[PDB]
């Protein structure tokens, strides 16, 4: 959690890589869907109980 900035973290913000990468995606692409479906299934199993 308190790890210093490494080269892996530094390369994500290198302007050359950002220039090459077109149509960029988020670092957490499917987490929102996972959490929303988890909320929906927890709600539906709470409603039946």
């Amino acid at each position: 959690l308190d790890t210093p900035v490494r080269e892996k973290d530094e390369n994500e913000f290198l302007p050359a890589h950002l220039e090459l990468i077109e149509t960029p995606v988020s670092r957490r692409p499917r987490l929102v869907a996972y959490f929303i479906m988890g909320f929906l299934v927890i709600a539906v199993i709470l409603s039946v109980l």
């Binding site: 959690l1 308190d2 210093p4 900035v5 973290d9 530094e10 390369n11 994500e12 913000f13 290198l14 302007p15 050359a16």
Partner: protein, 570 residues
């Protein structure tokens, strides 16, 4: 030591207004406490029993209470900011006065951007002080009135809040140090970036005269990527802290809801009492929420204070205040001086012994590496000799006031650095309120009036940079005028004619008898034709005196190295 005890005298000096701010804060807390009582009264005795006149009374009282509370809060914020502005002004003045008094070895071992960033930390501190961070601390501290009222209402829920507070304290204690470390890393990267930017903008002429844009751009890209990564880490930690605070707030909110529902069900608590208790609990937590989103401000002001301490804890070459030693007559003498650039560097001077009388134009010559160039930096107390003493007018320079000595002595170097101001602003730097006629006379003495005549703007021409916009000879003539426009008892010419052509040098040498009138002038130059009209010429070899005397007294004998040097020069 400047860490945090420096602000205590500032607080106590302004104690009579800070106590007033504290009393205004407690009155604001009382004003805030008033309103939930009015909601409880409305919910328990207006909605239940009867009547609308009591509702009108509550509304009309609440309107003026709210207006007064808003005005009082604004006044408290204004007064606190006004009081802290004076403290930050005092800190800034002290910081700059300390910065100007530091020794030259401090600046020679560092970069410009480092000091610039350490001084922008002053602006960071000023923004922290003149803000709404300490007012939130006051609001949080003065919330025990709410606790007393809540304990009057219900002890169980008050105990729940009282146990929630240590959760906030422990969460802050746990999540603070890592944020401070990340902000330390971010500040280090920011200082490096500022230093690179200053260095690249200052030397843009060489960057563009050469073709190294790609190298500079690559370095800038890497530095920017690192800095933004550090900033993102700091943002992530701040967000984690804020969400951790919100979790505790909502958990205790839910627990209070459950316990209050069970309480109201079992009697011994009305619904309006529960609503007022909930509003009081929210008003207690609101300062914590408002303080949890300025966490970076707290850690950054701590780090800025640490960096200001780093600047302000170094020793100063400040002053020697003893009897206010009088003016200088141009009597310089050296007694067994040996000097070393570093303690682990070869020796330059070994047993240089010298004595110069008032009004004596003395020339010092030699070859590269002879060590004649260090005498000018030794006369000013910049270079400290290994052992020996440098005496000016009988008084040791190691115990005298540096500013006094360096004010009495004027030095012209091989290359001189001006400021980004007008020509007259550079000539009269030591006394800007000085008469223009003196500036014109000094410029005419140095031969600088002629080349200024072909300038469209005249003496108002702004030197583009340290020396940009003027040639080398023009800069040398401007520096000579700046040295001469005062009344220096000692003049030093340290290859001050290398950049000049034959005509400008001839014009300067014709005025040399007006320049040397009543002053002790020391001429140091590679060429032997400049010290021809000197009262005494001195030859140095590897830090030792091998020959001295008049030019002919030395030119007559071919056995001397002076004759060999003159033959090579011709």
């Amino acid at each position: 030591k400047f860490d945090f005890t420096w602000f205590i005298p500032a607080i106590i000096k302004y104690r009579k207004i800070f106590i007033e701010t504290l009393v205004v804060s407690v009155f604001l807390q009382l004003f805030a406490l008033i309103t939930p009582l009015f909601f409880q009264v409305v919910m328990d005795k207006v909605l239940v029993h009867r009547g609308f006149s009591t509702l009108n009374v509550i509304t009309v009282a609440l309107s003026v209470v709210v207006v007064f509370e808003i005005i009082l809060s604004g006044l408290r914020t204004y007064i606190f900011a006004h009081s802290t502005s004076r403290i930050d002004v005092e800190l800034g003045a002290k910081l700059f006065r300390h910065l100007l008094a530091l020794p030259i070895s401090y600046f020679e071992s560092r970069r410009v951007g480092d000091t610039v960033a350490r001084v922008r930390e002053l602006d960071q501190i000023r923004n922290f002080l003149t803000g709404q961070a300490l007012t939130s601390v006051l609001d949080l501290l003065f919330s025990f009135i709410f606790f007393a009222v809540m304990w009057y209402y219900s002890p169980k829920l008050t105990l729940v809040i009282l146990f929630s507070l240590p959760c906030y304290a422990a969460w802050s204690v746990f999540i603070s140090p890592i944020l401070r470390r990340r902000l330390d890393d971010k500040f280090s990267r920011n200082a490096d970036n500022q230093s690179f930017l200053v260095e690249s903008v200052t030397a843009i002429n060489t960057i563009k005269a050469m073709a190294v844009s790609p190298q500079m751009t690559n370095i800038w890209d890497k530095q920017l990527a690192g800095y933004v990564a550090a900033g993102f880490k700091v943002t992530v930690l701040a967000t984690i802290g804020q969400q951790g605070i919100q979790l505790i707030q909502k958990t205790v909110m839910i627990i209070n809801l459950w316990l209050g529902a069970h309480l109201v069900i079992s009697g011994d608590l009305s619904i309006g009492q529960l609503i007022a208790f909930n509003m009081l609990a929210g008003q207690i937590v609101a300062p914590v929420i408002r303080l949890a989103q300025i966490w970076q401000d707290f850690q950054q002001v701590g780090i800025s204070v640490t960096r200001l301490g780093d600047v302000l804890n170094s020793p100063t070459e400040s002053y020697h205040g003893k009897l206010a030693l009088p003016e200088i007559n141009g009597n310089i003498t050296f007694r067994n001086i040996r000097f070393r650039y570093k303690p682990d560097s070869p020796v330059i001077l070994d047993n240089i012994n010298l004595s110069i009388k008032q009004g004596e134009v003395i020339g010092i010559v030699g070859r590269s590496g002879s060590g004649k160039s260090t005498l000018t930096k030794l006369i000013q107390r910049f270079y400290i000799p290994e052992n020996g003493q440098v005496l000016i007018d009988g008084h040791d320079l190691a115990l005298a006031d540096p500013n006094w000595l360096r004010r009495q002595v004027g030095v012209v170097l091989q290359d001189n650095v001006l400021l980004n101001r007008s020509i007259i602003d550079n000539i009269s730097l030591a006394n800007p309120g000085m008469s223009v006629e003196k500036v014109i006379y000094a410029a005419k003495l140095a031969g600088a009036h002629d080349f200024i005549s072909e300038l469209r703007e005249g003496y108002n021409t702004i030197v583009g940079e340290q020396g940009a916009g003027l040639s080398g000879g023009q800069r040398q003539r401007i520096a000579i005028a700046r040295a001469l426009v005062n009344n220096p008892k000692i003049l030093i010419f340290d290859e001050a004619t290398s950049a000049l052509d034959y005509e400008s040098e001839h014009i300067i040498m014709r005025n040399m008898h007006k320049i040397c009138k009543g002053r002790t002038v020391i001429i140091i130059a590679h060429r032997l034709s400049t010290v021809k009209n000197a009262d005494r010429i001195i030859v140095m070899e590897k830090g030792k005196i091998v020959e001295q005397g008049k030019h002919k007294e030395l030119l007559s004998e071919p056995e001397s190295l002076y004759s060999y040097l003159y033959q090579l020069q011709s």
